[PDB]
Amino acid sequence: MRPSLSDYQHVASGKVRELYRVDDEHLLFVATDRISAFDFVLDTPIPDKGRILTAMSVFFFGLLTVPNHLAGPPDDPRIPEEVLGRALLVRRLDMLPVECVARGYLTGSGLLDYQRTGAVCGHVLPQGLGEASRLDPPLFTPATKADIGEHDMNVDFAAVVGLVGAVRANQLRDETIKIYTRAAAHALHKGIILADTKFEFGVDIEGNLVLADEVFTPDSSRYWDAAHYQPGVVQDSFDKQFVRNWLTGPESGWDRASDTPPPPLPDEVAVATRERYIEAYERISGLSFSDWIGP
């Protein structure tokens, strides 16, 4: 009753997720409890973070109408007991080499590019925008993965055409904006702003576009509390602000500008952070995390 994880072949690790081969046409997509802050994977895990983000991704896959890479239910017998609730059975796709990012608000590298050049990913914007400015319409701001440990590189629409084809590039742009708009409106209705989001897509055997990776997690998207949205200043991270504040506060003993690895988190900060994840999940999904499956 359920295989061991050791029965599958590890094929890729990210900082936070792992991928295993199940057979020629299926993979096991595993979320860990690791958390990243200031581009460091922290020493301290967040309990149940992997299960909560898996629950979130499954919810949004269900909410969206577009084809996705899920290949079975969250309790599929192919999933080992050890990763139950934080692993998904998915179909193998030919992945497209584009980070498909939508921005509803101007922050991070999008804001920085604008402040440097007046444009973001080929979009020449109005003068006078700033931190957390609302963008209307939302922008397609594609990026490509760089070297290990390097940030993704922002690129323009012509670069996407060169990567995947002219018609496919149009399709990626249209789908990215459409599904971001739907999910952002849903979340905002529940009091959470999805400020931006990153998608990865693949193509199936028939040439069909399929949404893959994870969707609208607080790792793939900037979550903000709508009740405190204030254009012109930096918005708190809904999920990670307790972690960021402790690390840069007087108790950590850590100098962020040293680029030395940060120290472990207090247990109470890790537990509070877990609670923020559960809060975001339950408010967005209308479901109870106590009903989500586990070992």
Side-chain angles (χ1 to χ4, degrees), residues 2-14 16-144 146 149 152-177 179-204 207-243 245-255 257-258 261-274 276-295:
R2 301 193 179 281
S4 289
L5 188 55
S6 67
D7 292 330
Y8 296 142
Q9 293 187 331
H10 181 237
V11 298
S13 274
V16 170
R17 292 148 303 148
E18 304 171 332
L19 194 61
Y20 297 80
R21 171 192 181 278
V22 171
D23 61 25
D24 286 350
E25 298 303 335
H26 300 89
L27 309 151
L28 188 74
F29 195 30
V30 181
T32 71
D33 291 343
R34 299 188 216 99
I35 184 173
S36 174
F38 309 113
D39 287 313
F40 288 101
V41 178
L42 307 187
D43 292 346
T44 308
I46 307 299
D48 296 307
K49 172 175 177 280
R51 289 177 57 239
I52 300 159
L53 268 61
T54 299
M56 298 175 101
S57 194
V58 167
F59 170 76
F60 275 107
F61 277 132
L63 181 80
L64 305 172
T65 60
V66 305
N68 65 59
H69 74 329
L70 299 181
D75 66 345
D76 195 290
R78 285 173 290 183
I79 300 169
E81 189 77 32
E82 165 186 3
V83 292
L84 202 55
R86 62 182 181 88
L88 300 170
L89 225 300
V90 298
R91 39 176 169 155
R92 183 185 57 78
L93 301 160
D94 288 335
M95 297 298 298
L96 299 170
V98 182
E99 306 306 311
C100 290
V101 174
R103 302 184 187 260
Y105 301 76
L106 192 63
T107 193
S109 70
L111 173 68
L112 181 56
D113 287 358
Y114 172 78
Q115 292 173 326
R116 289 169 169 177
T117 71
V120 186
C121 296
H123 301 277
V124 181
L125 297 182
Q127 290 187 5
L129 306 173
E131 177 67 62
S133 282
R134 175 73 186 244
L135 298 168
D136 190 83
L139 297 182
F140 183 57
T141 60
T144 56
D152 298 350
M153 167 177 79
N154 292 337
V155 301
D156 63 14
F157 189 72
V160 182
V161 171
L163 283 159
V164 303
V167 170
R168 186 76 76 188
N170 288 336
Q171 186 185 26
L172 291 180
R173 172 170 59 188
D174 289 343
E175 287 303 300
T176 293
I177 295 304
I179 71 180
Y180 170 74
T181 301
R182 171 87 177 91
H186 172 90
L188 179 51
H189 188 64
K190 301 290 201 298
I192 293 184
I193 290 168
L194 303 175
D196 51 40
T197 196
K198 181 181 77 64
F199 306 128
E200 291 166 10
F201 292 92
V203 178
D204 61 20
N208 294 132
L209 191 64
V210 179
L211 181 60
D213 197 54
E214 72 194 38
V215 292
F216 301 107
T217 68
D219 284 345
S220 79
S221 321
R222 284 188 176 83
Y223 277 50
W224 296 342
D225 190 339
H228 295 296
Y229 172 49
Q230 176 186 336
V233 301
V234 176
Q235 307 306 290
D236 288 349
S237 175
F238 192 94
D239 53 311
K240 298 189 180 69
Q241 201 61 43
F242 299 148
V243 163
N245 290 347
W246 184 83
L247 282 177
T248 61
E251 297 205 357
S252 71
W254 183 57
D255 187 15
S258 64
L265 300 174
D267 281 354
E268 62 191 356
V269 173
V271 171
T273 296
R274 173 184 184 271
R276 284 299 261 192
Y277 284 120
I278 291 177
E279 177 180 7
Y281 172 68
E282 297 192 341
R283 290 175 63 179
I284 289 186
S285 73
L287 300 172
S288 176
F289 184 65
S290 68
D291 292 324
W292 189 253
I293 198 170

Coordinates of all heavy atoms in Angstrom, one line a residue, residues 114-153, unseen atoms left out:
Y114 N 11.9 49.7 -14.7 CA 11.2 50.9 -14.9 C 12.0 52.1 -14.4 O 12.1 53.1 -15.1 CB 9.9 50.9 -14.3 CG 9.1 52.2 -14.4 CD1 8.5 52.6 -15.5 CD2 9.0 53.0 -13.2 CE1 7.8 53.8 -15.6 CE2 8.3 54.2 -13.3 CZ 7.7 54.6 -14.4 OH 7.0 55.8 -14.5
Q115 N 12.6 52.0 -13.2 CA 13.3 53.2 -12.7 C 14.6 53.4 -13.4 O 15.1 54.6 -13.5 CB 13.6 52.9 -11.2 CG 12.3 53.0 -10.4 CD 12.5 52.6 -9.0 OE1 13.4 51.7 -8.7 NE2 11.8 53.2 -8.1
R116 N 15.2 52.4 -14.0 CA 16.4 52.5 -14.8 C 16.2 53.1 -16.2 O 17.0 53.8 -16.7 CB 17.2 51.2 -14.9 CG 17.8 50.8 -13.5 CD 18.3 49.4 -13.6 NE 19.1 49.0 -12.4 CZ 19.6 47.8 -12.2 NH1 19.4 46.8 -13.1 NH2 20.4 47.6 -11.2
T117 N 15.1 52.6 -16.8 CA 14.9 52.8 -18.3 C 13.6 53.3 -18.7 O 13.4 53.7 -19.9 CB 15.1 51.4 -19.0 OG1 13.9 50.6 -18.7 CG2 16.3 50.7 -18.5
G118 N 12.6 53.4 -17.8 CA 11.3 53.8 -18.2 C 10.4 52.7 -18.8 O 9.3 52.9 -19.2
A119 N 11.0 51.5 -19.0 CA 10.3 50.4 -19.6 C 10.6 49.1 -18.8 O 11.5 49.0 -18.0 CB 10.8 50.2 -21.0
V120 N 9.7 48.1 -19.0 CA 9.8 46.8 -18.4 C 9.5 45.7 -19.4 O 8.4 45.7 -20.0 CB 8.9 46.6 -17.2 CG1 9.2 45.2 -16.5 CG2 8.9 47.7 -16.2
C121 N 10.5 44.9 -19.8 CA 10.3 43.8 -20.7 C 9.6 44.3 -22.0 O 8.8 43.7 -22.6 CB 9.4 42.7 -20.1 SG 10.2 41.9 -18.7
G122 N 10.1 45.5 -22.5 CA 9.6 46.0 -23.8 C 8.4 46.9 -23.7 O 7.9 47.5 -24.7
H123 N 7.8 47.0 -22.5 CA 6.6 47.8 -22.2 C 7.1 49.2 -21.8 O 7.5 49.4 -20.6 CB 5.7 47.2 -21.2 CG 5.1 45.9 -21.6 ND1 4.1 45.7 -22.4 CD2 5.5 44.6 -21.2 CE1 3.8 44.4 -22.5 NE2 4.7 43.8 -21.8
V124 N 6.9 50.2 -22.6 CA 7.2 51.6 -22.2 C 6.0 52.1 -21.4 O 4.8 52.2 -21.9 CB 7.4 52.5 -23.4 CG1 7.7 53.9 -23.0 CG2 8.6 51.9 -24.2
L125 N 6.2 52.4 -20.1 CA 5.1 52.7 -19.2 C 4.9 54.3 -19.0 O 5.7 55.0 -19.4 CB 5.4 52.1 -17.9 CG 5.5 50.6 -17.9 CD1 5.7 50.0 -16.4 CD2 4.2 50.0 -18.5
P126 N 3.8 54.6 -18.5 CA 3.5 56.1 -18.1 C 4.6 56.6 -17.2 O 5.1 55.8 -16.4 CB 2.2 56.1 -17.4 CG 1.5 54.8 -17.9 CD 2.6 53.8 -18.2
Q127 N 4.9 57.9 -17.2 CA 5.8 58.5 -16.2 C 5.1 58.6 -14.9 O 3.8 58.6 -14.9 CB 6.3 59.9 -16.7 CG 7.3 59.8 -17.8 CD 7.9 61.1 -18.2 OE1 7.7 62.1 -17.5 NE2 8.7 61.2 -19.2
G128 N 5.8 58.6 -13.8 CA 5.2 58.9 -12.5 C 4.8 57.7 -11.7 O 4.2 57.9 -10.6
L129 N 5.2 56.5 -12.1 CA 4.9 55.3 -11.3 C 5.9 55.1 -10.3 O 7.0 55.6 -10.4 CB 4.7 54.1 -12.2 CG 3.7 54.1 -13.4 CD1 3.9 52.9 -14.3 CD2 2.3 54.3 -12.9
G130 N 5.6 54.3 -9.3 CA 6.5 53.9 -8.2 C 6.3 52.6 -7.6 O 5.5 51.8 -8.1
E131 N 6.8 52.4 -6.4 CA 6.7 51.2 -5.6 C 5.3 50.8 -5.4 O 4.5 51.6 -4.9 CB 7.5 51.3 -4.3 CG 7.3 50.1 -3.5 CD 8.0 48.9 -4.0 OE1 9.3 48.9 -4.2 OE2 7.3 47.9 -4.3
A132 N 4.9 49.6 -5.8 CA 3.6 49.0 -5.6 C 2.5 49.8 -6.4 O 1.3 49.6 -6.1 CB 3.2 48.9 -4.1
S133 N 2.9 50.5 -7.4 CA 1.9 51.1 -8.3 C 1.0 50.1 -9.0 O 1.5 49.0 -9.4 CB 2.5 52.0 -9.4 OG 2.9 53.3 -8.9
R134 N -0.3 50.3 -9.1 CA -1.2 49.4 -9.8 C -0.9 49.5 -11.3 O -0.7 50.6 -11.8 CB -2.6 49.7 -9.6 CG -3.6 48.9 -10.4 CD -3.8 47.5 -9.9 NE -4.6 46.7 -10.8 CZ -5.8 46.1 -10.4 NH1 -6.2 46.3 -9.2 NH2 -6.5 45.5 -11.3
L135 N -0.8 48.4 -12.0 CA -0.6 48.3 -13.4 C -2.0 47.9 -14.1 O -2.5 46.9 -13.7 CB 0.5 47.4 -13.8 CG 1.9 47.7 -13.3 CD1 2.8 46.5 -13.5 CD2 2.4 49.0 -14.0
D136 N -2.4 48.7 -15.0 CA -3.6 48.4 -15.7 C -3.5 48.7 -17.2 O -3.3 49.9 -17.5 CB -4.9 49.1 -15.1 CG -6.2 48.5 -15.7 OD1 -6.6 47.5 -15.2 OD2 -6.7 49.1 -16.7
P137 N -3.5 47.7 -18.1 CA -3.7 46.3 -17.8 C -2.5 45.6 -17.1 O -1.5 46.2 -17.1 CB -4.0 45.7 -19.2 CG -3.2 46.6 -20.1 CD -3.3 48.0 -19.5
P138 N -2.7 44.4 -16.6 CA -1.5 43.7 -16.1 C -0.5 43.5 -17.2 O -0.9 43.4 -18.4 CB -2.1 42.3 -15.6 CG -3.5 42.5 -15.5 CD -3.9 43.6 -16.5
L139 N 0.8 43.4 -16.9 CA 1.8 43.3 -17.9 C 2.3 41.9 -18.0 O 2.6 41.2 -16.9 CB 3.0 44.2 -17.5 CG 2.9 45.7 -17.5 CD1 4.2 46.3 -17.2 CD2 2.4 46.2 -18.8
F140 N 2.6 41.4 -19.2 CA 3.4 40.2 -19.4 C 4.9 40.6 -19.4 O 5.3 41.3 -20.3 CB 3.0 39.6 -20.8 CG 3.7 38.3 -21.1 CD1 3.6 37.2 -20.3 CD2 4.4 38.1 -22.3 CE1 4.3 36.0 -20.6 CE2 5.0 37.0 -22.6 CZ 5.0 35.9 -21.8
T141 N 5.6 40.0 -18.4 CA 7.0 40.4 -18.2 C 7.8 39.2 -18.1 O 8.3 38.7 -17.1 CB 7.2 41.3 -16.9 OG1 6.8 40.5 -15.8 CG2 6.4 42.6 -17.0
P142 N 8.1 38.5 -19.3 CA 8.8 37.3 -19.4 C 10.2 37.3 -18.9 O 10.9 38.4 -18.9 CB 8.7 36.9 -20.8 CG 8.6 38.2 -21.5 CD 7.8 39.1 -20.7
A143 N 10.7 36.2 -18.4 CA 12.1 36.1 -18.0 C 12.7 34.8 -18.4 O 12.0 33.9 -18.8 CB 12.2 36.3 -16.5
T144 N 14.1 34.7 -18.4 CA 14.7 33.4 -18.6 C 15.6 33.1 -17.5 O 16.2 34.0 -16.8 CB 15.5 33.4 -19.9 OG1 16.5 34.5 -19.9 CG2 14.6 33.6 -21.1
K145 N 15.8 31.8 -17.2 CA 16.7 31.4 -16.1 C 18.2 31.6 -16.5 O 18.6 31.4 -17.6 CB 16.5 29.9 -15.8 CG 15.2 29.5 -15.1 CD 15.1 28.0 -14.9
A146 N 18.9 32.1 -15.5 CA 20.3 32.4 -15.7 C 21.2 31.3 -15.1 O 20.7 30.1 -15.0 CB 20.7 33.7 -15.1
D147 N 22.4 31.6 -14.8 CA 23.3 30.6 -14.2 C 22.9 30.2 -12.8 O 22.0 31.0 -12.2 CB 24.8 31.1 -14.2
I148 N 23.4 29.1 -12.2 CA 23.0 28.7 -10.9 C 23.3 29.9 -9.9 O 24.4 30.4 -9.9 CB 23.8 27.5 -10.4
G149 N 22.3 30.2 -9.0 CA 22.5 31.2 -8.0 C 22.4 32.6 -8.6 O 22.6 33.6 -7.8
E150 N 22.0 32.7 -9.8 CA 21.8 34.1 -10.4 C 20.3 34.3 -10.6 O 19.5 33.3 -10.9 CB 22.5 34.2 -11.7
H151 N 19.8 35.5 -10.5 CA 18.4 35.9 -10.7 C 18.1 35.7 -12.2 O 18.9 35.8 -13.1 CB 18.2 37.3 -10.3
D152 N 16.8 35.4 -12.5 CA 16.3 35.3 -13.8 C 16.6 36.6 -14.6 O 16.6 37.7 -13.9 CB 14.8 34.9 -13.9 CG 14.5 33.6 -13.3 OD1 15.5 32.8 -13.0 OD2 13.4 33.2 -13.1
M153 N 16.7 36.6 -15.9 CA 16.9 37.8 -16.7 C 15.6 38.2 -17.4 O 15.0 37.4 -18.1 CB 18.0 37.6 -17.7 CG 18.1 38.6 -18.8 SD 19.4 38.4 -20.0 CE 18.8 37.1 -21.1

